[PDB]
């Protein structure tokens, strides 16, 4: 069973990747 | 620049729905990470290393 | 599960389960970085006290 | 005198037996006292006023 | 119920329920915390 993790975009906790257009899945987000 | 101490003390927690079975594992994980220095290392990386 | 900088409050705890705080925080004072101010007109008296 | 900042982050908690009925009310009581400033008032009373 | 300055640790939490921290702390450094009347003659030796 996959687990869904909810999250707000806040830096440096969770920020959009600079090259998220060439990435898919959980690789789009980086941060704390 | 940040000056002075903390006026108050709050905390950030990993939330979990009431009655869920994951609540106790995640609580144990947070304490384990803190004592192992993982949380301090993560704080240093995204605040000062970057 | 919500892994985020969510502040632990009494009202939230009545509805969800919060883990132990993985990072503590508080209210702090933020001021501009002090740069070298322009010297005063009568600044030649600075070396000795009034 | 105390100098510098805290190296790590710890916390003092009220301990209750596993499965005790006083777990949740004490958990909400501690949060209540923190938000209303009783905990901050108590610390300042026994650390600075005294 | 234990109401005492009891540190929240991993080994303790598995055996007893721990409420939210009523005090936040950490490791701190402890260190130890007037000119003479005729101190204007300090630059040169006696």
UniProtKB/Swiss-Prot annotation, chain A:
What does the entry report about post-translational modification of this chain? Answer: Palmitoylated. Depalmitoylated upon L-glutamate stimulation.
Q: What tissue specificity does the UniProt entry give?
A: Detected in forebrain. Detected in dendrites of neuronal cells. Expressed in the pyramidal cell layers of CA1 and CA3 and in the granule cell layer of the dentate gyrus.
- Compartments reported by the entry: Cell membrane; Postsynaptic cell membrane; Postsynaptic density membrane
- Induction remarks: Down-regulated in the pyramidal cell layer of CA1 in the hippocampus by global ischemia.
Q: Which domain of life is it from?
A: Eukaryota
Entry text on domains: The M4 transmembrane segment mediates tetramerization and is required for cell surface expression.
Share any extra remarks. The postsynaptic actions of L-glutamate are mediated by a variety of receptors that are named according to their selective agonists. This receptor binds AMPA (quisqualate) > L-glutamate > kainate.
Biological function: Ionotropic glutamate receptor that functions as a ligand-gated cation channel, gated by L-glutamate and glutamatergic agonists such as alpha-amino-3-hydroxy-5-methyl-4-isoxazolepropionic acid (AMPA), quisqualic acid, and kainic acid. L-glutamate acts as an excitatory neurotransmitter at many synapses in the central nervous system and plays an important role in fast excitatory synaptic transmission.
* Recorded family membership: Belongs to the glutamate-gated ion channel (TC 1.A.10.1) family. GRIA2 subfamily.
Q: Whom does it interact with, and what assembly results? A: Homotetramer or heterotetramer of pore-forming glutamate receptor subunits. Tetramers may be formed by the dimerization of dimers. May interact with MPP4. Forms a ternary complex with GRIP1 and CSPG4. Interacts with ATAD1 in an ATP-dependent manner. ATAD1-catalyzed ATP hydrolysis disrupts binding to ATAD1 and to GRIP1 and leads to AMPAR complex disassembly. Interacts with GRIP2. Interacts with GRIP1. Interacts with NSF via its C-terminus. Interacts with CACNG2, PICK1 and GRIP2. Interacts with GRIA1 and SYNDIG1. Part of a complex containing GRIA2, NSF and NAPA and/or NAPB.
- This protein's name: Glutamate receptor 2
Originating species: Rattus norvegicus
Swiss-Prot record, chains B, D:
Tell me which residues are marked as the site Interaction with the cone snail toxin Con-ikot-ikot: 32
* Induction pattern: Down-regulated in the pyramidal cell layer of CA1 in the hippocampus by global ischemia.
Let me know which tissues express this protein, per UniProt: Detected in forebrain. Detected in dendrites of neuronal cells. Expressed in the pyramidal cell layers of CA1 and CA3 and in the granule cell layer of the dentate gyrus.
As for subcellular location, the record says: Cell membrane; Postsynaptic cell membrane; Postsynaptic density membrane
Give the free-text PTM comment from the record: Palmitoylated. Depalmitoylated upon L-glutamate stimulation. Ubiquitinated by RNF167, leading to its degradation.
Instruction: Describe its partners and assembly state.
Output: Homotetramer or heterotetramer of pore-forming glutamate receptor subunits. Tetramers may be formed by the dimerization of dimers. May interact with MPP4. Forms a ternary complex with GRIP1 and CSPG4. Interacts with ATAD1 in an ATP-dependent manner. ATAD1-catalyzed ATP hydrolysis disrupts binding to ATAD1 and to GRIP1 and leads to AMPAR complex disassembly. Interacts with GRIP2. Interacts with GRIP1. Interacts with NSF via its C-terminus. Interacts with CACNG2, PICK1 and GRIP2. Interacts with GRIA1 and SYNDIG1. Part of a complex containing GRIA2, NSF and NAPA and/or NAPB.
What does the record say about domains?
A: The M4 transmembrane segment mediates tetramerization and is required for cell surface expression.
Stated role: Ionotropic glutamate receptor that functions as a ligand-gated cation channel, gated by L-glutamate and glutamatergic agonists such as alpha-amino-3-hydroxy-5-methyl-4-isoxazolepropionic acid (AMPA), quisqualic acid, and kainic acid. L-glutamate acts as an excitatory neurotransmitter at many synapses in the central nervous system and plays an important role in fast excitatory synaptic transmission.
What other facts are recorded? The postsynaptic actions of L-glutamate are mediated by a variety of receptors that are named according to their selective agonists. This receptor binds AMPA (quisqualate) > L-glutamate > kainate.
Question: What is stated as this protein's family in its record?
Answer: Belongs to the glutamate-gated ion channel (TC 1.A.10.1) family. GRIA2 subfamily.
Would you tell me the protein name for this molecule? Glutamate receptor 2
Gene name of the encoded protein:
Gria2
The part of the entire sequence present here spans 742 to 791 of 883
């Amino acid at each position: 069973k996959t687990v869904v993790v909810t999250t707000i975009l806040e830096s440096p906790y969770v920020m959009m990747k600079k090259n998220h257009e060439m990435l898919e899945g959980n690789e789009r987000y980086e941060g704390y | 620049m940040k000056v002075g101490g903390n006026l108050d003390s709050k905390g950030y927690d990993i939330a979990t729905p009431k009655g869920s079975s994951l609540g106790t594992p995640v609580n144990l994980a947070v304490l384990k990470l803190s004592e192992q220095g993982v949380l301090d290392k993560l704080k240093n990386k995204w605040w000062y290393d970057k | 599960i919500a892994i985020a900088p969510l502040t632990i409050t009494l009202v939230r705890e009545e509805v969800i389960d919060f883990s132990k705080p993985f990072m503590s925080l508080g209210i702090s004072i933020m001021i501009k970085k002090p740069q070298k101010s322009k010297p005063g007109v009568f600044s030649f008296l600075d070396p000795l006290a009034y």
